[PDB]
Every structure is written in structure tokens, then in C-alpha cells.
Amino acid sequence: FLPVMKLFDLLYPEKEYIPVPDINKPQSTHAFAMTCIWIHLNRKAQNDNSKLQIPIPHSLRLHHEFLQQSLRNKSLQMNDYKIALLCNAYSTNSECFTLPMGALVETIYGNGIMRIPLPGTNCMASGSITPLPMNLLDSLTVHAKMSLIHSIATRVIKLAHAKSSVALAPALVETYSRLLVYMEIESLGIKGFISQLLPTVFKSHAWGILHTLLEMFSYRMHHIQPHYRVQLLSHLHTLAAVAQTNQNQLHLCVESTALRLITALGSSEVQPQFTRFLSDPKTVLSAESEELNRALILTLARATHVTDFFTGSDSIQGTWCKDILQTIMSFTPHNWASHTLSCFPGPLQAFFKQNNVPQESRFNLKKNVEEEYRKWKSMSNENDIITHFSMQGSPPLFLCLLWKMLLETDHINQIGYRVLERIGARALVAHVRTFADFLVYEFSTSAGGQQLNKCIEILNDMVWKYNIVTLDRLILCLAMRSHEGNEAQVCYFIIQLLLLKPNDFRNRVSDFVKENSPEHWLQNDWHTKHMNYHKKYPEKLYFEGLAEQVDPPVQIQSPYLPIYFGNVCLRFLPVFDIVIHRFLELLPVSKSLETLLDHLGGLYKFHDRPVTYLYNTLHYYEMHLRDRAFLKRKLVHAIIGSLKDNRPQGWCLSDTYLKCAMNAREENPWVPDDTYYCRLIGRLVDTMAGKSPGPFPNCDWRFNEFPNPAAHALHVTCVELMALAVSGKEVGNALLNVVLKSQPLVPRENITAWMNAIGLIITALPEPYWIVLHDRIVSVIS
Amino acid sequence: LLEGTMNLTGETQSLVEQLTMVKRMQHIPTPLFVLEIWKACFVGLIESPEGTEELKWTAFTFLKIPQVLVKLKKYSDFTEDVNCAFEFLLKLTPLLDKADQRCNCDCTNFLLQECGKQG
């Protein structure tokens, strides 16, 4: 820092005093920064001041006197930016930084100001709900921010290890979610948090800090690096194996996080990330639950056929996929369907000819549950039926006991209430797996009529009137049914009636899409709207609805966990995606997806990455969706109209797509000229370089699903290009007749970028789209 | 290309004594010579920007190229080689098809009737 005053003379050669302007702009701290630099040079001159001091400059001493008056000042807040001036001119001090620190830490931590009641019982979260805004988060120095981080860490260590009743304020958890995105602090950020803060929280054994951290990792993070993603995946596997996680919320939150990060995976990182944990493939897999392993297998399936890595081979041997699946098949036997095998890659289909468990017999499945159904009433004592029906190792058959009670009496006694809570949510996935098998097997042979509508409503009785589980788990267990032919269609129609015949969950979805928006960081009162939504619908997560219907009066009053961002709809949207995938895997359940999309299109208001998901959905079923035209047109009728408001105008669609695509079919699709495709290529090539107005709107790319506008443009262009009713045969003809034949609106001395975009498009395109290039090259070589 | 830019108002013999001498300096086949003669005429037609310069360049490529070729036939065999020159010339599909977007029609018919008019 020696020659910097000469850097003054080239930058600021002046003679007249600098007046003090208005402080209210966040950029004024940039203008007041060099005064703070001089006073921090005096902070450097705090020690060894006998060597070569600098006199105060004539022009800057007016603002130096101003900051000295601010030091004499005893009031600082958001009225001006003197909070930033006193946090930045005195950041390298020992006690001059504590004066703004005392104002800051008592206004967002919630230091016992107010105890807001969260939904549930006995949840006194702290008072403050207004976090540090975006302009405040950038008006501070890095050292002031990291000193604030150290102070916050010293507060939360003694808060977590004491397990105090003082919870963390919504303002401070919002600020905590906001600060971790900045990679300048990442050395002491989440890398310094999973090294320091997370081991101390693990040693604390608090179970509430972990739940809130999981809440702000699932519903508040947007860009986690894949190595950090699998590090957190290992951390949650180490956490869930210990600390008696038999609670419903502890299992449910970690399931909604694991399935989220499974669905947040793409298609290109599957190969380099696996060899990092190739030494330990077992611990990154589910040992007890079929659901997570099947989700990972389908993640592998969508990461290979889309990237077309399987072609040129027809076996799994000699690749990186054989050993991970060898670790998959252990301790989790899972069947596979032929229609599900249809969209699988060739080597994957060849490997699925072995190591595949068959289905269990329906007749014995009903015979055993009926044989112990009469043993339920052979003697009706409490303790013997509680113990005999609920040890770990019993065949999971209890939902049919409950169902045979509520087919004709609608009453669950003390035994039924005690068994379900004694089993715990860790075995509830394995229970509901076989219960979904009961459901599909029972409706396969069911007779239509009054029972068809009665059964779905008494099933909704467990959904919202008994509150046994969150709705997502049962529907996902019904989604992974690997049956052949009629039973798969029957289960799809089970889900079809489950989503529309009861209106309670649809009322909650409507309430959340009307009263909440995905822009959570810009929503300062997100906590207030969450409290209103949870007060409208009382979320019962510990069999509370099941408790009041018990014939003896039995109630649960356990204290709930601190919940700020969790709800059923966000936990169900990945299940809503996997059921859509299962529907599109099978043919004769096509039009049933058509009536659902226009019915339940609002939940995609709150999708973490809807564009990539719809692109993969339309790409993976390329051999399943080209034949069904109106089914392919139906998708743009529902999901695009959902996120057309919060995402700005022109975020996804083109003008002629708004004119002719979502219009209903008339047996005459608009076969376009090549200039329509040239418009899309011109959209792509300008967004690759980027423009200040931009054809596509700018957004907070830190909190998006794309870190760059180029990735945002590529995905939407890939969505719109291959969503037409025409198959992947004429698409290549049009793409080449743009370039192989002459074209208007396409200029030279730029065509390299155009053909680069076309090449990336056609490599992102499915197999028949670019297999026609071989037939093209045959003609020109001959 | 330099002649039709600004100094296209001269006589027909300066360009002749330039280009025929160019064939003296570098070994150039006469079919390749006529191939260049016609592809320069096409390029100066299409690559000329729209405006009065388009009209000037098209007139330069249409009205002075018969004058030089009549004198070349007078001073020189010149019937057989231009057939192989057109054998070369009738393969340039995309660049000359890009000219037909601007010209909205088939210029080949007009030019191959113009050559017949020149005999």
C-alpha cells in the first residue's frame, strides 16, 4: 500500500474541499470508500505510528471530519447509509465496530423481542422478520461481513449447544440463506461451515438446528456445487444413521431434500461425480428404501439416453455403471416393467434382463392379511395386538386392517394409533410400499360404482382427516409400481381419481399459488404469508388427525420443529413430476394426463427447475410422444401459463408460438417456413453473446436454475424446437435447408456462430433427429 | 473487382491489356480464365449492396463483359474451352442460388440468351 497516494494523484488531482452529499444511496458508500481507506490507513497507523505518518489531505479532510462526526454520532439505521459508513470505516477496529454491531445484532437475530407461534405446539421463534436487503448486503466491506459471520457463529454455537428455547428469527435465517451464495466468503462460507459449524451442530445433538438448516438447504439454496452436493449427501447419510431419527418430520424433510437433489441432477455430471465416490458406492445409496434407489436409477436412465452415451454398445460390462448397480441391488430388491424398459437405453435394457426380482403373489398377499385380520379380533386386548402387529420384521399389512375398519365402521382404536407411531417414519416407506401394492392389486380387481368414489374419499380421510403421512410418499410409492399392462393403467387411474376427487389438496394448491410467489428473497414477509397459509390449513405431521378419532381419548402434544418454509405442495411437486413421467411411459393413460395438466398447473409456479424437467420429459419420451399429438400440445396449455407472470414477458416462448402452438388442434398444424427456425437460431446466437436489453429478460442468475443466460436460452430453445407435432425427420430437413440451401435473413461473416448453435441444438436433439444426417451424407458422397 | 468500383468509366481496352497480360505472367488455363470471368460477374451482382451501387455493379457486370470477350474472340479455340469453363461454372450451387433470392428469378436464362445475342 506504499505508492497508493501517487495513485491518488493520477486519480484525484484536486484542490477544493469535498462536500458531504446525501447518504441514502447504497452506491454512496462506493463514493465514500476512499475516506474509509484513509481512516483504515490510520488504523494501520494504530501500531508503530512513529514511522512515516501521512498528513491529512486538504480535500478529503472534510469527509474525514464527517466520518469523525459519525463516530461522535450515536444513531444509525436504514434511514441513511451511515450504518454502512460506520461498519466500513471502522471494520479494522477493536471497539469502534461494536457500536454498529450492537444495533445490527439486536434487530435481526431476534434477541427476545417477540415469540411468534409457528404451526404446531410450543414453537416460540424469534421476533424479527425483516432481513438485510440486497443493497445492504453489498454496501459492506468483506472484513465487516466476515466479522459479522464470526459474531453470528459465536452466537449460534452457544445457542445450539445449550438447546435454548430462544429460536432463530426468520430475518436471520433469510440473511443466512442470502449470505452463503457469495463465493468471496466461501472460504469461510459453506466450506467453512460444514468444517466448523456443522460438526459443532452434530456434537450439539439439538435436532432443531439441523432441521432448519435442511429447510434452508432444500427451499432456499439454488446453486450447490456437485462435489458439495455429494458431500452433503454423505453428511445426511451419516446423520440419519444415528441420533434416533424415528420422527416423522426428520424422515420427511430428509426425504424431500434427497428427492429434490436427485431431481435437481442433470445429465452430464453423472460420470465425473461417480468416480469421486467410487471408493464408497454403498453409503451414497439407500439400504432400506426402494424409493431413493429407484429415483437414482431413473436419474441414471435420463442421464444416458438423453446424452446418447449408450449407443455403439449393448452391455453394462466394462463401464462405470455395472458396479454402482451391483451396489444398488444389495438389500433393496426391486422389480421392473417392460413399458418402463421401453424407454431405457440398450445396455441398460440388456443389464435389466438379470438381477430383477419378480412380483409377489396377489392371492397370498390378501390371504395373509385376512388371516391376521381375524387374529386382530380373536382377542381385542391392547398390548398383545399392539406388540404382535408392529415389531420390525412383521409383514407390513396394517393399512388393510385400517381399511377394513373404515370400509364399514370408520374407526381406528388405540392399537391402530399406537402401532403406526411405534413403527416410525423410517420403516413407513417400506410399509407404504407394500400398501401401494395392496392398493394397485385391490383396484385391479375392483368393481366400479359407488365403491370407486367411496374408496378415494376414505383414502383422502387418511390424507387430511387422519393426517397419517404427507401425501407425496404414498403417491410416489404408487408411482414406482413396475406392473405389466392392466395394473399399471389401474394404478394411474388410482392417482387420477386421487388428485381430483378430493378438493382439499387442490384448495391448498390454489391458496399457495394465489397467496404466495416463488420470489422468496424479494418477499420480506414470506414468514407472515407462511403463517397465514399454515393457519388456514393446520398441518398435522404426528398423527394428530388420527388422534381425535381414537375410541379412547388419546392425543399427542409433542413440540413441533421450527418450520419456516416447509409445506405439502413443495414436497409433492417432485412426486407430481414422477407420476407425469409414469403416465407418459404408458400409452392408454394419455388423455388422463390431459385433464390433469389444466387442473393442477399451478404447482409448477414453485418448481426449482421446470424448464430442464420439461425438456427432459419431452426428450426421453421422444418415441412415446410424437405419435400422440394433442397430448404433446397439452403441456404448453398448462405449465407455460403458470410461470408467465413471475418470470417476465418473453422468458420462454416466441410470438408465433403464442399465436399458433397452444391453440387446439385443427388437423392442420402450421408447417413453418425456414425463416421461423432462423428466428430461433437468431434468438440463440444473440443470447450466447448476451445483449444489454436482451431478447430474454435478465434475472438473479444466482437464485435461478441457470448460472448464465446462455444455459437459460439453450434449454428454452430446445424445448420450443422439438415440441411441434412433426416428428424428428423433417426437423433435420428444415435445419439443413436453412444452411444447405440458400436462406434469406441468414447473413455471412457470422455463420460460424449460427452453425455452432445448430450443432449444439442437434447434439441436444434425440436420436432420429440427427440420424438423418447419415442419409444426407449418403446422397452427397454418391 | 477494382475496375467496376470507381474507374469503370474508361474504355474497353485498358482492362483487356490488364487481364490478358495477367494470363501471361501466371500460367492460367483459358477455361479457368472464363470461369473467373463469369464468377466475378456473378459475385459483383450479388455482393453489391442494395441501392444505386447495386444497379451500377449489375450494369458493369452485364454491359462491359461482352465487349472484352468479343475482342478476345477476335484476337483468339475460344469456343471449345468456354464449354469446359461452364462445366466448371455450373457446379457453384449455394452461392449463385443466394443470388436468385435477391434477383427472384433465373439469371442464367437471361445471360445465356445475352451470349447468343452477342453471337
Curated annotation (Swiss-Prot), chain A:
GO process annotations (BP): positive regulation of gene expression; positive regulation of T cell extravasation; positive regulation of transcription elongation by RNA polymerase II; positive regulation of transcription initiation by RNA polymerase II; regulation of DNA-templated transcription; regulation of transcription by RNA polymerase II; RNA polymerase II preinitiation complex assembly; transcription initiation at RNA polymerase II promoter
Record keywords: Activator, Disease variant, Intellectual disability, Nucleus, Transcription, Transcription regulation
Subcellular location: Nucleus
GO cellular component: core mediator complex; mediator complex; nucleoplasm; nucleus; transcription regulator complex
GO MF annotation list: transcription coactivator activity
Main localization of the protein described in the UniProt heading: nucleus
Keyword 4Fe-4S: no
Summary of subunit composition and partner proteins: Interacts with ELK1. Component of the Mediator complex, which is composed of MED1, MED4, MED6, MED7, MED8, MED9, MED10, MED11, MED12, MED13, MED13L, MED14, MED15, MED16, MED17, MED18, MED19, MED20, MED21, MED22, MED23, MED24, MED25, MED26, MED27, MED29, MED30, MED31, CCNC, CDK8 and CDC2L6/CDK11. The MED12, MED13, CCNC and CDK8 subunits form a distinct module termed the CDK8 module. Mediator containing the CDK8 module is less active than Mediator lacking this module in supporting transcriptional activation.
Entry's disease: Intellectual developmental disorder, autosomal recessive 18, with or without epilepsy: A disorder characterized by significantly below average general intellectual functioning associated with impairments in adaptive behavior and manifested during the developmental period.
Job of this protein: Required for transcriptional activation subsequent to the assembly of the pre-initiation complex. Component of the Mediator complex, a coactivator involved in the regulated transcription of nearly all RNA polymerase II-dependent genes. Mediator functions as a bridge to convey information from gene-specific regulatory proteins to the basal RNA polymerase II transcription machinery.
UniProt family annotation: Belongs to the Mediator complex subunit 23 family.
Descriptive protein name: Mediator of RNA polymerase II transcription subunit 23
Species annotation: Homo sapiens
Gene name per UniProt: MED23
Curated annotation (Swiss-Prot), chain B:
Residues shown, of full length: 249 to 371 of 989
Domain of life: Eukaryota
Function: Component of the Mediator complex, a coactivator involved in the regulated transcription of nearly all RNA polymerase II-dependent genes. Mediator functions as a bridge to convey information from gene-specific regulatory proteins to the basal RNA polymerase II transcription machinery. Mediator is recruited to promoters by direct interactions with regulatory proteins and serves as a scaffold for the assembly of a functional preinitiation complex with RNA polymerase II and the general transcription factors.
Subunit comment: Component of the Mediator complex, which is composed of MED1, MED4, MED6, MED7, MED8, MED9, MED10, MED11, MED12, MED13, MED13L, MED14, MED15, MED16, MED17, MED18, MED19, MED20, MED21, MED22, MED23, MED24, MED25, MED26, MED27, MED29, MED30, MED31, CCNC, CDK8 and CDC2L6/CDK11. The MED12, MED13, CCNC and CDK8 subunits form a distinct module termed the CDK8 module. Mediator containing the CDK8 module is less active than Mediator lacking this module in supporting transcriptional activation.
Tissue-specificity statement: Ubiquitous. Abundant in skeletal muscle, heart and placenta.
Family the entry assigns: Belongs to the Mediator complex subunit 24 family.
Subcellular location: Nucleus
Protein name listed in UniProt: Mediator of RNA polymerase II transcription subunit 24
Species of origin: Homo sapiens
Locus of motif LXXLL motif 2: 92-96
